[PDB]
Design a protein around this ligand. Structure first.
Ligand SMILES: Nc1ncnc2c1ncn2[C@@H]1O[C@H](COP(=O)(O)OP(=O)(O)O)[C@@H](O)[C@H]1O
Ligand SMILES: Nc1ncnc2c1ncn2[C@@H]1O[C@H](COP(=O)(O)OP(=O)(O)O)[C@@H](O)[C@H]1O
Ligand SMILES: CC(=O)N[C@@H]1[C@@H](O)[C@H](O)[C@@H](CO)O[C@@H]1O
Ligand SMILES: CC(=O)N[C@@H]1[C@@H](O)[C@H](O)[C@@H](CO)O[C@@H]1O
Ligand SMILES: [K+]
Ligand SMILES: [K+]
Ligand SMILES: [Zn+2]
Ligand SMILES: [Zn+2]
Ligand SMILES: [Zn+2]
Lengths: 304, 306
């Protein structure tokens, strides 16, 4: 008999949801992520909670999915695509402002948790939730339970470096080596995300187009976009084949902005086998069943 | 009467190790034979003989669990085992079930190792354990909340067949880096770099002499120039590659097994070198040498049948 709030915080947008005691979604809000000012970042979150509390006449529970890691010892955030939040004790800061406990979990973990709880995936021995947004994130579920890892880093596939076969595709010593918000270089976060898709286009063609614009040019059969999409589909297959040789997930669920690129679901099953072991069988690869809400739902229900 | 007996096999490229464990799980037999490398019939014979002999010795029909490098196809049961040429492409489980007239369980070697190591009372309650074999190849066994994740197609933990990451290539000279062919038929898999065999191949690549890992390590201990250069390069390469793996898996405990796990310097150097390549907020896992020595494979295989 509560109200449960969830936040799904990404590099560019914050999604907010409120769910009643029967878990029905009764609020839905979206705001831009403040990426520069930490004060503005906190304000955005606090406003949404306060507004919802005023609307429903309650003090809602607060679960937040963050695009990054709260240090397991200090609580300070590493959010590679949110400069504003870097180094701050988000949980503590919010508990102060909102005068109640706050649970923080990684965004991809929340997404994976929600998607794995779907009746269709109940009973699957493993599920990998993959977010391809401003960054690349993974949530690892084994027998229905999240593996969050020794230091809340499990599933941080975005901060693994391009594998040799991917570098080969991109031209080896001539490959674009993109800087990462984690301060490393060549992290796949900057290649397979919708942002990375854009950066790869710009690197090869010297024009700053959005992912939806490139995809639209692709749909028209425009030469540069067709070349870009071929390169990207192969890069995606190579990188995910490496990850699947380590993790071998039963089901892979894709979320984030770039998960709306329908071609991915056609091309991945065709391109993965060449890069997997000979006896590998493909995982079930599906688009998010909860649309754009799995992160919010996962976050909200941390307080269940 | 003897009671229930559990047999385990650790099948390697050169030798087959057998163990029989009684109902109290005490090891009461230990046998080692050459791995038949050509004839599959000879391979099966070696295994069947050990089971039959042990059965005759103890007056029982023991359960049979087998650890082997490579993968039994999840659909066909055919083995993908590049390092066991005799068994490649064969339905080992079915063939043995016919010969031995009882069920046979087949598991990956690194999975067996991880299962045995994680069952230790001190690890049994850890939220995750990664068993890593550094031997002729590089293999991983992934345990989450005390249960092995064997994966969609029995491939979970095949970290040896992931390709060198960019930061590792950079260390090795990028377009001038040695790109070793792999038994899986890919190129640049870490199986051929971080294993004891890989350690040797890297030495040979840079120095053109085919020394064994123990020879190189002994030269290193004497401060010989080439070995010192090799070991520095290798320690950094190992840290880079494992940092990539740990950023994906973030294991609570990592247990090292296989021949190269005997190189003690690894346990000193990894904690020093990993942080630079991990995320800023990463905390190191507990990194330990195998608590069961060279026996975790046999024990893990035997106890598949517990
Ligand atoms: N329908 C779409 N098709 C393809 N790419 C999209 C689509 N919507 C958003 N994107 C891209 O996804 C990225 C943004 O990721 P998203 O998950 O929306 O949020 P966040 O920035 O919070 O991670 C951008 O590259 C954006 O252009
Ligand atoms: N004590 C040791 N110190 C260092 N390396 C070792 C040691 N013993 C074996 N090795 C190396 O480990 C590799 C052998 O792998 P091992 O685990 O013995 O068998 P398998 O071939 O079944 O994996 C070889 O490179 C060997 O030289
Ligand atoms: C260290 C870091 O910032 N990682 C985040 C990751 O947690 C998140 O899941 C992903 C997608 O939003 O983007 C980033 O890679
Ligand atoms: C595909 C293949 O042969 N992989 C094996 C792996 O199963 C084993 O665990 C590892 C260590 O023995 O060596 C190889 O990497
Ligand atoms: K994660
Ligand atoms: K394995
Ligand atoms: Zn990074
Ligand atoms: Zn390989
Ligand atoms: Zn010598």
């Amino acid at each position: 008999g509560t109200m449960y709030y969830g936040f799904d915080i990404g590099g560019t947008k914050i999604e907010f949801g409120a769910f009643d005691a029967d878990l029905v979604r009764v609020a839905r809000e979206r705001v831009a992520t403040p990426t520069e000012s930490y004060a503005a970042f906190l304000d955005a979150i606090v406003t949404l909670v306060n507004n919802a509390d005023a609307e429903f006449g309650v003090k809602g529970t607060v679960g937040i999915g963050i695009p990054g890691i709260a240090d397991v010892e200090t609580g300070k955030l590493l959010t590679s695509n949110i400069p504003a939040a870097m180094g701050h004790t988000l949980q503590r800061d919010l508990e102060e402002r909102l005068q109640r406990p706050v649970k923080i979990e990684n965004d991809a973990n929340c997404f994976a948790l929600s998607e794995a709880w779907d009746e269709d995936l109940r009973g699957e021995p493993s599920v990998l939730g993959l977010i391809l947004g401003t960054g690349v994130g993974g949530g690892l579920i084994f027998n229905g339970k999240v593996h969050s890892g020794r230091a809340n880093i499990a599933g941080e596939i975005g901060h693994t470096r391009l594998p040799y076969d991917a570098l080969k595709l991109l031209g080896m010593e001539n490959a674009p080596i993109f800087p990462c918000g984690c301060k490393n270089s060549g992290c796949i976060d900057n290649y397979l995300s919708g942002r990375g898709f854009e950066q790869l286009y710009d690197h090869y063609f010297s024009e700053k187009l959005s992912a939806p614009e490139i995809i639209a040019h692709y749909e028209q059969g425009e030469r540069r976009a067709v070349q870009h999409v071929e390169r990207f589909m192969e890069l995606l297959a190579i990188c995910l084949a490496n990850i699947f040789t380590c993790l071998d997930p039963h089901v892979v669920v894709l979320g984030g902005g770039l998960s709306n690129f329908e071609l991915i679901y056609q091309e991945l099953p065709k391109r993965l086998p060449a890069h997997l072991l000979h006896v590998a069988k493909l995982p079930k690869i599906i688009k998010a069943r909860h649309g754009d809400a799995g992160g919010v739902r996962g976050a909200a229900f941390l307080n269940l």
